[PDB]
Amino acid sequence: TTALVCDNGSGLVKAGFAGDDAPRAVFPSIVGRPRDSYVGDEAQSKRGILTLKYPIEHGIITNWDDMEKIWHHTFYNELRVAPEEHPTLLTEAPLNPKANREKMTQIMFETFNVPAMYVAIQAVLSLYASGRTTGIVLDSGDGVTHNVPIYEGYALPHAIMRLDLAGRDLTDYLMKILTERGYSFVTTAEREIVRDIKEKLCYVALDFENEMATAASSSSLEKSYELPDGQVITIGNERFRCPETLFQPSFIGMESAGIHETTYNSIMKCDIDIRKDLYANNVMSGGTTMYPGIADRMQKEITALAPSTMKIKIIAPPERKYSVWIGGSILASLSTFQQMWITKQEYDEAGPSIVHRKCF
Numbered sequence: 001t002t003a004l005v006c007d008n009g010s011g012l013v014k015a016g017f018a019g020d021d022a023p024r025a026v027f028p029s030i031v032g033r034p035r036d037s038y039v040g041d042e043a044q045s046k047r048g049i050l051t052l053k054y055p056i057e058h059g060i061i062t063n064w065d066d067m068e069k070i071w072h073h074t075f076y077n078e079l080r081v082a083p084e085e086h087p088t089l090l091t092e093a094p095l096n097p098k099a100n101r102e103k104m105t106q107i108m109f110e111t112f113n114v115p116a117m118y119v120a121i122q123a124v125l126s127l128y129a130s131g132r133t134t135g136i137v138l139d140s141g142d143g144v145t146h147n148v149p150i151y152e153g154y155a156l157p158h159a160i161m162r163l164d165l166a167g168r169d170l171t172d173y174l175m176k177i178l179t180e181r182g183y184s185f186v187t188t189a190e191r192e193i194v195r196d197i198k199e200k201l202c203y204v205a206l207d208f209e210n211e212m213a214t215a216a217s218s219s220s221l222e223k224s225y226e227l228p229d230g231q232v233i234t235i236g237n238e239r240f241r242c243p244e245t246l247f248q249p250s251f252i253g254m255e256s257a258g259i260h261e262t263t264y265n266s267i268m269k270c271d272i273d274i275r276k277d278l279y280a281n282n283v284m285s286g287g288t289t290m291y292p293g294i295a296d297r298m299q300k301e302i303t304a305l306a307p308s309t310m311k312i313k314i315i316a317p318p319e320r321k322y323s324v325w326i327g328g329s330i331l332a333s334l335s336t337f338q339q340m341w342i343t344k345q346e347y348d349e350a351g352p353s354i355v356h357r358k359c360f
């Protein structure tokens with residue numbers, strides 16, 4: 001039968017069928033229970049009477065009962081499949097604990113009775129989707145941003161870097177600075193509008209201070225945005241101040257290094273034998289890398305940090321919002337991969353620890 005691919009993130013589930021070019025189901029990774037459980041948009045609609053929780057925090061599954069609900073809902077309600085009929089590829093964060101990976105495996109086989117499964121590293125899937133087995137991935141999602149250097153298909157765990165800021169932070173920051181302008185974006189409905197502004201109108205400046213001067217000197221950078229009630233507002237320097245936070249986390253009160261410095265710092269940790277290959281194969285992935293201008297800015301920033309003679313390249317695939325999912329879709333469809341699934345029989349004999357002998 002067809003394999004399933006489920007890429008569970010902190011903010012969004014991306015799920016579908018291996019061989020498709022995109023996930024069929026993309027929905028909020030949220031479970032609501034009375035203040036008898038509800039998922040995603042149905043939980044958000046009932047937030048007045050439910051306590052909402054996110055079962056994945058910074059990519060890691062932290063609430064297992066709620067994750068079981070997400071997975072059940074995904075199979076039965078979003079995909080409308082019988083999970084016992086389909087091999088299922090799941091994804092994991094960088095540095096996912098062994099015990100976590102084993103528990104995911106056990107749930108798949110014991111709670112959902114899947115015939116087979118696999119767990120792949122999200123960054124490896126994105127690198128693979130880009131046509132590479134060596135490079136360094138910058139994966140910026142809704143909750144977390146990571147740098148994952150990968151050599152000949154293997155993630156280098158000693159050199160993974162984390163930045164505890166991503167898309168939900170940028171949405172909230174945009175609300176804040178738009179409010180400072182004189183608007184009022186404060187309510188949860190107002191958050192949804194601002195996520196839309198963010199995804200439609202924001203961009204990364206090549207030179208932040210130059211761009212500030214331009215925005216303050218003229219209207220050349222302003223855009224209008226029609227609100228749900230029909231009211232038209234103007235977005236100016238907020239277009240690029242919002243994603244500047246990726247490069248300057250101090251904008252939201254964080255002391256952490258920005259994404260250019262985490263990229264550089266990750267590379268430095270890797271064997272000097274492979275540094276030249278990482279610099280020439282920086283691959284962007286995840287929703288929060290979607291800003292226009294981000295590759296150009298990274299290129300400039302890493303150039304400043306690295307030795308002057310280093311060849312540096314930033315690859316930002318058009319389809320990078322879902323490249324984790326797409327890599328999973330391709331991989332699960334390959335003839336060669338079919339020997340790699342962990343089968344129910346194999347799990348029955350070896351137990352959950354079989355999952356660690358994985359090549360993705």
Ligand SMILES: Nc1ncnc2c1ncn2[C@@H]1O[C@H](COP(=O)(O)OP(=O)(O)OP(=O)(O)O)[C@@H](O)[C@H]1O
Pocket residue numbers: 008009010011012013058059140141142143144145166167168195198199200285286287288289290291321
């Ligand atoms: N075009 C866009 N421009 C800017 N941000 C975007 C765009 N599209 C999506 N995003 C943001 O990307 C985030 C979702 O990305 P993604 O699905 O990669 O995250 P995730 O897997 O849910 O989270 P994480 O990887 O942090 O666990 C949201 O915050 C969303 O607003």
Ligand SMILES: [Ca+2]
Pocket residue numbers: 008009010122141286324
């Ligand atoms: Ca993700």
